[model samples]
Target: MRTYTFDQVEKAIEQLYPDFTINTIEISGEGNDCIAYEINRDFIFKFPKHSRGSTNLFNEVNILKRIHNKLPLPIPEVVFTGMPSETYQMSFAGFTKIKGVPLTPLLLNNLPKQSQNQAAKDLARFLSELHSINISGFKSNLVLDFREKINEDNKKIKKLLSRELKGPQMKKVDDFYRDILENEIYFKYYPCLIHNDFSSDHILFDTEKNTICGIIDFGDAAISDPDNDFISLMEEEYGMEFVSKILNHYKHKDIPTVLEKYRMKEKYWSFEKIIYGKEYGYMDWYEEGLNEIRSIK
Candidate 1:
């Protein structure tokens, strides 16, 4: 649990809705990208790390504005946006929260295929409604800078491999990157408004209704390769076959191959964790990410 102190968060909420007072605040998610928290009964506060680009913040805001009216699913209404005060050292966005249960528990591996299929269908419908919107806002393209970051990551990989980790396990990591490079063109799809970060933690479902009621966490939403959203399916353990079915239902082009490319990147992310964890003493996080990588294989 992490978030601003009572006074700091109170000031932030007061900046927008002067009438409300906070009863609680808690930090959520282990991602290095941002901080998200439930505030009172009606809002969630999301604070991105200082390293995140301003464009990311802007793109997220644009996605909300573009889809709030059009989405069949409940999406948060952006209530406030600003950098945290000097007391809190991050940029944050706040939202009018929608009520629903977190979808994490539903991801159990042995959960019935029928339940999983319904989950997939509900997500497909939400995505369909979002993609149906045709408004032009943010420039829909991959940031060239992110590509540079990928190269930088590759350099780090080479340095890691240059060490004593030349075993078969390490070679598998190398193969993953080689595959990514070979399939680079397949990942070069045009960007659209994509809810690129749809981890189970972000989805809000209603078991009683058997539908996805809310979709939160738009921080990763962007005008980049649309398949980034499909990565969430892979993360959720929606096998490649059903993942393809979901993509086909959406009528998205090159979705499967695009999915393969990002899955490669996701694996590379895991491999890099091994080195980064060693270098930065983030052993626990490294172990967790490594476990996920192994599970995917």
Candidate 2:
């Protein structure tokens, strides 16, 4: 709910730095814990909205500073750090903009095969290098036990007193849920550094070059199954052909082993979205979740 608005952000900037000024400041987007402000098209500022937001800010800074130069793709550079004050309760930081937009279904759909291949290789290289990072001194609080995770979700989702699409729709989801839970063949993987939220939302595209220019938002980054990184590629909506191509170029020893796992995980995501949406009061997840499940039968 936090944002840079009529009474807060614009006024606070001038008060904090009497000399520092900007022609325009725009509130770009808001996440669960931070409000993003793209100031005058030059800097992207993330202001903390809660205690979790404040702490996550430092976590992002530490991780980004350590890993920015290690990867092939461009990423945000931490530049301006601000402390909590009367006008602002949480610490914030400004990052030098790695300019590009999220690659959308429309943009991806329009790309020629050359551009698609270029994207696959570029992303493959990025993930390979990213996951290869040694977690020598890295500190994080992410525990990813895939079996336990699925079980917990199943327990929670099945307990819902009501669901948007019940009976037949619910039965379809229930069967698929059991399919994964019973199938031990789909459950083995080595843990590694992962972009937990790797998706078009965080993947910045340089349309001219048709390559991923930058990857932003490390708040959700953690050590986990490397295949979790590929889950979001399904969101591109191109299905098997797209992901199969990326797997061809992903050079990791875990490539072919990780391929089919993504599809299984992705199918579960759609069902989980609908079930959890009803259980957790996230109604927005219902329609799209329903759309995918409807197409299945």
Candidate 3:
């Protein structure tokens, strides 16, 4: 796998568009999967960190181009897409920068109550619009059902817990999954287009205005259960109080069932991260998991 330096990225961009004059290139963002550069503070250029990320980056570009207008919130508007070349073997994408900072958990907590309420309403509307879209015309790689996914995850969780946790720690996790299995009826929903990775990282907010501005990274968007989108709401380290605000604005027939399912998932994934050491910034998933389990009791 090839990695990029600041100079290499600058050269690649220049080579791709020799006519464009370069002014400033700075590291904008990086994740487990990709690296992003802000070009002249006007555009964001993203390159996959590995071979596996190339296809998803390509698909995300296509997905954004197709669904940008149908979405209620702002999304990445791909200005240019480059295929693999001698300069860089990985495909890269560039889009006009959507000016806003990520609505990370810490930022969300510091926001004023009024701003928080408005943010919740805006996010609810965004998710409502995203989940309401018709998938008949959509084309991408997204898992639509959780039957097999849950089963696989369950197996992995069990193995990890057996190796890493014991007693109440392990029992709590076992019981959480058992409850999910028992309440299988709540998990059944007609498939719709969902931003399967609707996390704080992807949801951008204007801190000064205290409202959501735009959303980016549709790499995980898929035709799947709507509940898949809510998982992040729990992981944000916000209590049910914050989630209740989102629920209040959201229009849904299965509110009660969805809340129940959300709690179970919240507990499951939080602990799963702790035992497995999955990294998503600085939150302590184990401590979060302990709190979640305590609340249910």
Candidate 4:
């Protein structure tokens, strides 16, 4: 696998679009999967870090193009997409930059009373629309084996974590899964389009305006448990208090069930990340996931 550098992507972009004059280039957000470069502070160019990253980069471009304007809020539009080749190890893309910082717990908490209310409504409307969207093509990859996925991820988690965690801690982990596998609610909800990773980081907020400017990063977007999207909102890390406002504005067919499932499934949603970080050999991700598990323990 070939890895790209800042200078390499900077130079490549110029040649890729010879007609466009380049100005200032700076590093943007580099997450576990993608390395983003901000061009003139208005555009973002992204390159993948691994095989999964490469595939997700492609998935984001493809998914958003089909549903970018379909939702209430704006999402990243793939202005440029590069195919796989010898020189380019993985796929890459660029989109117009969303001008806002992440709506972290602190940021959301600091907002004024009315600001918080509006933000909740905005997010609720965005999610309400996103959950109801129906994509026509590439529908095959959208549906996930929810139970099968958890079972598979747990297999990896159990094998590796046994060496690190204490017997009691291990018991907690096992009991968590055993409880999920046994619940009837776990298997009943129908899958819908979801911003699968709807964490604070992906939700962009304009502090001055006290509003959610747009939703960004759809690399993990897929059709999954419609209620699974709420796990992020109800997460203590995100903003458990703010979830009610969203539920207030959002209409849903799975209300009583949606309410029930997010609470039940939140732990598994989070645990799945650590397993991915570990299995995919991303030590930073592993550390982040492990730290979360440790701190909350």
Candidate 5:
């Protein structure tokens, strides 16, 4: 795919949706994969930054189409899907905007206790509905196998083992990998539909009432271990107490054990961030992972 500039994006929007008037076009979100622009404060247009991200755009649109009405919370409703073009080689789509800001830690922490509790319950219910969807019917090329992901991450960890760590840090990493290799049973689970990228970034919150307004971004949805849906919550600084609030609201029996395994695996991703410098390339994140490793005993 060709690299797209803001100019190209504007032109593509004009070509695709000429009738709709765009008062302003601003870059709403950008990552390695895709770039999003909010149009006229009512719609969001998303296009892939790289050819590889083309599939994510297709997957997200189709997944949203399949389950948009199934959940209690609001998700993006596709208004128009544009095909690949000469200017923008990758396919693109636009949806009516899901109102509310991302539920970051600062916003969540500031909410009244009652509101937070309500938000937690809403999220639990949303996930309950999401996970209940039949995985066999909704097929996608992006679905990942649990064991394959484990092996892939293990290989990356091995490559990074000798770099950027020493002594106890190295030992902790070793033990983490060894534990995964020994107890493969913990990683085994019946496949279910999961929002594989469930995190604060994708959850929208109404700060006034402190309730969840919507959940967005199904680009990474997959049929995988159900526990994968909850792991990102461990990344939040809310601690186990807050995690329990959400878990208590969920209709799952094995959540406590799943929560433990998720926390156990978080350190791996934290360390991988250090190794790969994929997300925000910050030393603090690596140190934070190391701090968690030190506290692992």
Candidate 6:
């Protein structure tokens, strides 16, 4: 498949308004699935590509429409949703840009104690706000039930070990999946609307204020165990105390079950994420898998 280019998109945008001039389009965000750009006038354009393009592209817009009004903090106001002419031929969405740098770089420091505490608090409250939404009816791409997903995971592991994968990595994959199968009850916890995948990479931080200014990448939103939000905290090389602070706010009463389920699922999910990553040519996955397993073990 031919990838998109600025010239093609520029011409397409001008087709909507003949005199419209684009300052430029440059990639500005993460995720291997999409092409994101900043246009002139503080506007941003997001185009989804890769495996789940349409599903992820439309789901973010859909989830934002559902949660924007109720969100405790700011969310990008979508400007337009339409086809990007024949050249790109993929659906696209536009939103007024949100300003802030990623929290990733800042979190790795010998900073003041207060700075770390405040950042943790801000992330905690942000998570609390998302978890507060009555998501009983809100849904998208969620398993809703992992009973069958667990079974599917087991079979996939067998298949991978039997063929596509080899080494101690493959044996670890087998052991993890078997453990998930043995502990199925842990997967059936009460559900909440989850960012489904949360990471510093997905959050934009305002360094001066030490708060989350805006959130991006809603592609993984779902009604799942809330601890999906917390796993990165425990798994990533930093911030055990900060993760605890976030969990204190998650205080959903039943959040403990979700946390348990995520901890139970992590070994297996970590393996799947690693195997899939290796299949896709990412050595970083193997490195992370070893680190996380060492910590958990």
Pick the TM-score winner: 4
- What's the ranking of the predictions by TM-score, best on top? 4, 5, 6, 3, 2, 1
Q: lDDT by residue for model 5 over 27-140, one digit each (tens)?
A: 888765678888788988888865656667878888888887888999999997878655443478898898999988778878888888887898888888888887777654
Residue range with the least summed lDDT across 10 consecutive positions in model 6: 82-91
lDDT (Cα atoms) of all candidates against the true structure: 0.64, 0.73, 0.74, 0.76, 0.75, 0.66
Question: Model 6 off-target regions past 4 Å?
Answer: 15-21, 84-90, 108-115, 164-175, 252-266, 273-297
TM-score, each model?
A: 0.69, 0.73, 0.76, 0.82, 0.79, 0.77
The best candidate by lDDT is 4
Q: Over all chains combined, what TM-score does candidate 4 have?
A: 0.82
**What value does the lDDT take at residue 183 in candidate 4?**
81
Ranking by lDDT: 4, 5, 3, 2, 6, 1
Task: Report each candidate's C-alpha RMSD, comma-separated, in the order given.
Answer: 5.3, 4.7, 5.1, 3.7, 4.3, 4.5
What is candidate 2's lDDT per residue for 168-225, written digit by digit as tens? 8777767877888787755676667788878778878888777778899887676677
Residue lDDT tens for model 4, 1-297: 346776788677766777766687777878767888898878898888777677778778878888867988878887877768654444678899988899888888888999989988998899888887874565666666578777976788888776777777777777777877898777776667888888788889988888899899888888777676777666645655687667768755456676567666655545766777675676777777666665443
- Give the distance in Å from residue 242's predicted Cα in candidate 1 to where it truly belongs: 4.3
Clashes of each: 1, 0, 0, 0, 0, 0
lDDT of 6 at 54: 50
* True lDDT of residue 195, candidate 6: 83
Where does candidate 3 stray beyond 4 Å? 84-90, 109-112, 151-183, 266-297
The predicted structure with the larger lDDT, 5 or 6, is 5
lDDT of 3 by residue, 5-31 (tens): 888887777777888777988889886
